[PDB]
Amino acid sequence: STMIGRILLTVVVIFRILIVAIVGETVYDDEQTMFVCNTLQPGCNQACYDRAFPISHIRYWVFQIIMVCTPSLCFITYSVHQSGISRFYIIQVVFRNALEIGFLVGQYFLYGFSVPGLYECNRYPCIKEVECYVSRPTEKTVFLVFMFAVSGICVVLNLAELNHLG
Amino acid sequence: STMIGRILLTVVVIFRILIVAIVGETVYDDEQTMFVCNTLQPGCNQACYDRAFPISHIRYWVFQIIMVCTPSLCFITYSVHQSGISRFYIIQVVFRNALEIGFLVGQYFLYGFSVPGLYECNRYPCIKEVECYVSRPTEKTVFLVFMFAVSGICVVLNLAELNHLG
Amino acid sequence: STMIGRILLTVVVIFRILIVAIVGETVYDDEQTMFVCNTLQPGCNQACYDRAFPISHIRYWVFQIIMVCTPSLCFITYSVHQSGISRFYIIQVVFRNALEIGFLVGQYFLYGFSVPGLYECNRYPCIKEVECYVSRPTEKTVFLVFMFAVSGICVVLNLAELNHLG
Amino acid sequence: STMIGRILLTVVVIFRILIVAIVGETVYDDEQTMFVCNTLQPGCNQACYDRAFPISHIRYWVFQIIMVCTPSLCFITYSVHQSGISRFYIIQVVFRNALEIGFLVGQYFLYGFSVPGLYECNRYPCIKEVECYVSRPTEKTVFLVFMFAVSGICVVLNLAELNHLG
Amino acid sequence: STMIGRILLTVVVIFRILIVAIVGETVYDDEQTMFVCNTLQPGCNQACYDRAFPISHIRYWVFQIIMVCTPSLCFITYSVHQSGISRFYIIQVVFRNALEIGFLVGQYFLYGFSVPGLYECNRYPCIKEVECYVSRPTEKTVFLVFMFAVSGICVVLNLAELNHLG
Amino acid sequence: STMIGRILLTVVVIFRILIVAIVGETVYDDEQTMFVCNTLQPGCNQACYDRAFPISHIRYWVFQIIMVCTPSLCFITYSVHQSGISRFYIIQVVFRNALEIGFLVGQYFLYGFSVPGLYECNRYPCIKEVECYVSRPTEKTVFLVFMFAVSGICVVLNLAELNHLG
Amino acid sequence: STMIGRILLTVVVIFRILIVAIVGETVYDDEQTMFVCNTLQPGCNQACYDRAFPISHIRYWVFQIIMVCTPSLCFITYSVHQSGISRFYIIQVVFRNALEIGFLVGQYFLYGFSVPGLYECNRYPCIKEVECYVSRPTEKTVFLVFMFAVSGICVVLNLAELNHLG
Amino acid sequence: STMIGRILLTVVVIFRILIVAIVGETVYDDEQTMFVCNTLQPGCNQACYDRAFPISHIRYWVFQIIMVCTPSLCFITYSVHQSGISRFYIIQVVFRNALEIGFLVGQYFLYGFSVPGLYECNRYPCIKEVECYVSRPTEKTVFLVFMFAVSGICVVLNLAELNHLG
Amino acid sequence: STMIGRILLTVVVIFRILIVAIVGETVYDDEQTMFVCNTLQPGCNQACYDRAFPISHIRYWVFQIIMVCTPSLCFITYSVHQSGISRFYIIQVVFRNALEIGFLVGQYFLYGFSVPGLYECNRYPCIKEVECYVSRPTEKTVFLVFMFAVSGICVVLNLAELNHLG
Amino acid sequence: STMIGRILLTVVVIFRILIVAIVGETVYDDEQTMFVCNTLQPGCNQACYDRAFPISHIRYWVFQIIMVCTPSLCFITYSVHQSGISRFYIIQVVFRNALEIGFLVGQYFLYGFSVPGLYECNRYPCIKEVECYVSRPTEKTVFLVFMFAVSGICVVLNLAELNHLG
Amino acid sequence: STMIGRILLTVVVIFRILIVAIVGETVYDDEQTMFVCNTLQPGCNQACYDRAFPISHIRYWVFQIIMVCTPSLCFITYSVHQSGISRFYIIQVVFRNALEIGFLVGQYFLYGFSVPGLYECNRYPCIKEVECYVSRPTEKTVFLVFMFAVSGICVVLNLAELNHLG
Amino acid sequence: STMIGRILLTVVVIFRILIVAIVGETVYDDEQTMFVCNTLQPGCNQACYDRAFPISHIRYWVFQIIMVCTPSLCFITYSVHQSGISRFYIIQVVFRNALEIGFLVGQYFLYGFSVPGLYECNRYPCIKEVECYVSRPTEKTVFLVFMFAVSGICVVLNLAELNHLG
Numbered sequence A, B, C, D, E, F, G, H, I, J, K, L: 001s002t003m004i005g006r007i008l009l010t011v012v013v014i015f016r017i018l019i020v021a022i023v024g025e026t027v028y029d030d031e032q033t034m035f036v037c038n039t040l041q042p043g044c045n046q047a048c049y050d051r052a053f054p055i056s057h058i059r060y061w062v063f064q065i066i067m068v069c070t071p072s073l074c075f076i077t078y079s080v081h082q083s084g085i086s087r088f089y090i091i092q093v094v095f096r097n098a099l100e101i102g103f104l105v106g107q108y109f110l111y112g113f114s115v116p117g118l119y120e121c122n123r124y125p126c127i128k129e130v131e132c133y134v135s136r137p138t139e140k141t142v143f144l145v146f147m148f149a150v151s152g153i154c155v156v157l158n159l160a161e162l163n164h165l166g
């Protein structure tokens, strides 16, 4: 039961990395070039795009992927230098759990579960409130939901192993 | 008879991967930049493109290709860790069959068998119904048909081997 | 006499692959962006480009190159698994001959021997007949002729070897 | 206590390099193409962009990363040629400390801690003072703060080891 | 005297390949996008660009570089299969000489020694004669002269060795 | 004293190559697209850009870097074929010195020490004198000064070693 | 009672003529230049304007004013030539009554009682239905109502006099 | 005292007519052509102009001028036909008083005492509220105030004479 | 019976003159400014407008009106100079009849009975056949029919009087 | 001496009226259409034109001309009704003097003695200060000076006659 | 025979004046606004229009009409002052004949008998020869022919009377 | 001899007035709308037009015509009031002579004898010197020469009469 858990954790991690690396950089390529607002005021598109999308999804996901692999690198560097291992194993498992729960919660609080097609903006230099229009909202919603599901699976598996060792 | 089946399955898989990887990313590059509607309303092109092409073909095909190769990776990781194999062989064959039938059915239900040159749109902020025009419809239809044929071949071969073991 | 034939077949194949891979992808890059028609009708450029160039030359050539190398891959995979060879040699030679004659005939029937600078279009939504103008016709004609010559050489050589074994 | 310090220094360095190399080149790609000023004067955008952003952040960070790794390369080349080592160790540690403090101070003096959305320009050929608008200010502020934090960590660690040897 | 000739021939060949491969593809990138004619007629720019630059310099140089390295590949493939060598050496030297003289003569007859800044065009659909303007003529002239000089050196060296063996 | 000189020469050479290879190709990417002149005459921008920047800095630097590494390649090829060495060492040192002094002098005579923001042009088809505006002048001035400093260091070191052997 | 009726009929007629002659020609001056439709199709504005306003109000009113004054001119010309008068008086009164009732009914059937701000058009070459926008609708509605009121007064007065003579 | 009142009434009336007739038609000529709103929506300018200026000042003033001269025309036509006069004098004086008070009150209720430079509009097809800009507001305010003053003088004089007869 | 004929002829003539003089010059004012063709060719609008409307209706009608009043002017000038009259009366009646029949026939042969909304043009410099769109076709058709009716009435009356004298 | 004064006063008045009436309305016709500011802000041209030219010169001059002729009209109407004259003569002379001095002073205080070619504007919605450019400044300055000279002559003459009667 | 000649001369003169005065000013109104050349050079339209139409037809015709009526005015002024007449009659007849023959010859030499639709221009600043397109050529040709016919009639009549007196 | 001089003076004056009044106002109508300069600087067209044409020809001619008729008006007003005449005759003749010589000299000094097609401008805000292009230069030159000739004739005649009285 604990044998397969490691195999599936490794497979899930590699699957997530591959999905992010091969296709995600090209859904977001035209994010700002196809963003448009109904206005004649210079500079309003810049302010409204910046307010609607402060940090792009793909940047957040790359950062999370890199940060959740640091304890393994630390353990490897330690063992390489060696040339209390069990204490290091315990601590790195604890740290990985904490990091993955923090990142999932932050994703939920930053983005939610959908990307709408319209946005209402009231930032200077825009006069009163203006209406703006988003590029590719459905594909981005699908990507959001898929990433949340994968990260949930990973959280479940790591809690499984944590309780297995105890 | 069962000897050649493995060889042809491997050759078909590699052929499909090569065709998708080398040329497909450059037919779809201008999909939205050359999409145009007969209108003077800001934001109508975005909504109508999003409604006509919710998920691009190339994204779906990359996802399918990656997902149909996961049982092999699991089997490899298991055997590497080992350093009931036959039960694993049976189960992974079953899973591969199921995954490939599901993906073929989903392709048929999402896209059909042709890409038309005109599209009729009635989404806000467009006033009533508008007419829009697609880029490269014939090449995309050819690509659709070719991919369906290859996936059908793969389904047939996997059912062949499933019935061979029994 | 039969000794040099293999050497020249290998050299011709590699030469063709190199020419296609290094330069051909950048002659066709601006094919649709520099295509223009004399009209004020929205959507006419898309329809007329699609009717003039249904499948681009470079796509056809990549497909042909990949498909004419499949019998070798099959033979290699068979011999690797082995770890009636002569029957396989005979059959793969026959298949290669057939495939290369089919592809050369199809090229002639799809494209002919020249690319003209003007095109006359009568597809909806264009009103009556309109005149359109092509990008880089002379270079594309040179490329067409060169590829036909190379494929003819390959056909001759394979028939040579077929008659050598008999 | 001195054992883990080396491991964490190596991990911090690699983390910083990865973050800069994978994502940073694509936040700054549209820096000048989406810079706009409220004016009808030709040449004012060029002068005002040049005055607002004399050296781009990403250029400065690449230069710093390369320059802080030179003492290690020198030590490696020396030891390779050898085929007073401790004196070289002392000197290279001193030099690394000095270089990293200089670069952090220079960053603070060149850029500060935020990127504002508006800029006020009074350079020829602009008539009197004009108002200009920046692209992606929030993401760039986040990047600035993150890089300062990482470099501070590195400074602390190197002072730690310097005082450890004494 | 014959010892150094081989060394310098190899060095000249590698130098030419490096110069062509690293920088030449980016001088010609904007060749047609920055070509402009004084006219209001649709389609005149396409015809006049095609008449002024039938085959681009960089295509011709890549083709020549690849074609002048084929005898070496043939000799290598022959010797590999072997696992009258002197007759092959003689013949391949003769062929290389002929190929390089033909390519140099063709360059002179196709392009000459300079690229002018103005071009006079009288092709349909242009009305009478029109004036057009070229991008980056001085850099292209420098490149032309450099390539002619290198190819002349190579011709001299190969004739040297031909007369050395006799 | 002569021991460290080799180490620092190697380190300086590698540093220069890295700086040129990683960042320099992307400062100059928009050199002509953001060049603008105050005029309504077609073709004036092309002529004035060509007169202001006959050969781009990055082309000159790549050429110099490649040409100053040829004597080493010659020496390596000679020693490989061998499988009067000191005479070759002397001669290649002399040649490297000469080449580096020539390239530094040529840089000074071609470009000077700064890139101004305005340029005054009087070339046909421009009527009388017109005013044009440059992109990113400050960054290009910084790059110029840095490259001059590095090349000066290299000249000093090579003269050092020349006088060391005598 | 019959004495004042003539005075008020003359005053009403002159008032109507003055109102039409002095101001009405300048409300309708920009009728077609400020008519606009939401479309990119050439020729749609012409067809939709023609369908919305077949005959302009001011043309109809001028025609009516001229046609209702013809019996008086006939009577004057007859009396001038004379140099059964009562029969002519009776007949011209009858004719004036008939003409004014016909013109009022026709106005009601052609135009109604209001001018709306939006118009829905489905005429070739417009694709399906389009939305168009009118200039100065409120002023035109006020003018319509005023003219109907005046013509009603005139009808009442002429019936009064008709019944007075009997 | 009653002698001069008639003279000044006649002079005031003629002065008002002259001011309206000679200059007023050319202040309002560009009223709609120089009206502009900050928006990209087709048809918003028409709706907002119509809502801001339902009836133009000059139309109202022409109508008032014509309507306040009708009792005199009636009296003249009566006396001409005659070829109880005092009763007619009394009645026409009463009617003139009433008409002029009504028109002054209506002016105050329709327009007020100033024309502002900005207008806030919320009419379909405009999205939410938009800002629009008026042409020549100061001159129009001056004209408004002048006309109110003149009409007040006329009211005072007519009440004077009414109380004089009693 | 012959008494009223003169009265009605005079009334019809004056009515026709008034209708032409007051309103007709302002229906045709925008005839060429609102004429548009679907094309990108310079000069095609001029040629197609000239071919569709060689002589404008209003010019033809003014010419006809002036030419049908010349015999009266001749008779008046003769009688004024006098200060065989019946022979002059006969001849001028004959001439008026002939002139009016000729002008009516010419109108029918030049214009017909309707003005269509579309026109098909094949004149140089237009490429093949193009489609063009007319301004105000319905109003112009109404005007055509009205003018034909009036001229028919005049013809009938003049034949009446011709047969009356005999 | 007093005899000629009346003749010259009448001639000066008529000359001024003719100059204003025949040419002045066509210098000012394009006053706002050729007014332009260096800005991209919608509505700034309207505000800056309104602030630079609150009341146009030609309006002020027409008003002054009409107002300085009212005492004569009053005197004429009085004498016509008569069908103490000297008291009326005295009073009207006094009033004319006062009116002409007031109008000359007001002209000086409103406009000064020149019209500059540049104007500096700081009114909302313009951001900070902008530069604007005037149409036909020299002709307008000449007109200003001429009108001041004529009005001065008239003032002198009226004071002459005032002191003549005493 | 000589009696009717005067009557017809007077009628022809009045007819010509009426035709020129009522319609001719509105055929030529858009002469330069609808003149267009195929070029991108600023100022070419002005030069080519000026070279194609140095003096407009309508200016020449007005001048001729005014100049051919001067002898009558002279004779009238002489006879009015009188309050050798036959000598004046003779001389003015001679002068009128001469003036009308000169004007007809000049018309033929300036304009010919047709107005073509295309014009070929080679004036600075136009580069080489350009093609331009004329407005309303057919109507202008008709006008030309009509005016020549009328002037010929007048010449014939005046020679008739000259020979009548002798 | 002195009898005809008055007749010809009156005829010349009336001829000049008619030529100026009927046609001259419509040659100059588009003077500034068709004035264009080769530049991208806002405001340069205004400054250069103002510097090229400070006072338009037609304004100068109207002013001169009005000012040369003032002595006659003075003489008429004097004689009307009378209801030393010879002294007035002498003085007005002297004044007319002086005025006409002054105006002719001023014309020569202001305008010269031709209107060129090109103008060279160096006024702020134009950068250095720019080239501008004039509308209708040939017609304006013809008008200039004609007006000079007429004014010369008038000068000659007035000197004739001056010397006749003595």
Ligand SMILES: O[C@H](c1cc(C(F)(F)F)nc2c(C(F)(F)F)cccc12)[C@@H]1CCCCN1
Pocket: C022, E017, E020, E021, E022, E025, E062, E065, E066
């Ligand atoms: O990708 C382009 C390229 C590749 C290659 C190959 F893949 F064969 F090595 N060869 C190139 C050649 C060559 F002549 F075929 F070597 C010329 C120009 C660009 C080449 C260049 C290579 C250098 C870096 C810039 N792109």
Ligand SMILES: O[C@H](c1cc(C(F)(F)F)nc2c(C(F)(F)F)cccc12)[C@@H]1CCCCN1
Pocket: J022, L017, L020, L021, L022, L025, L062, L065, L066
């Ligand atoms: O209205 C313009 C005009 C009018 C008058 C006037 F009202 F005094 F008679 N004078 C004009 C003059 C004149 F020199 F003052 F006579 C010149 C040019 C145009 C004039 C011209 C007159 C002729 C027909 C075209 N408009």
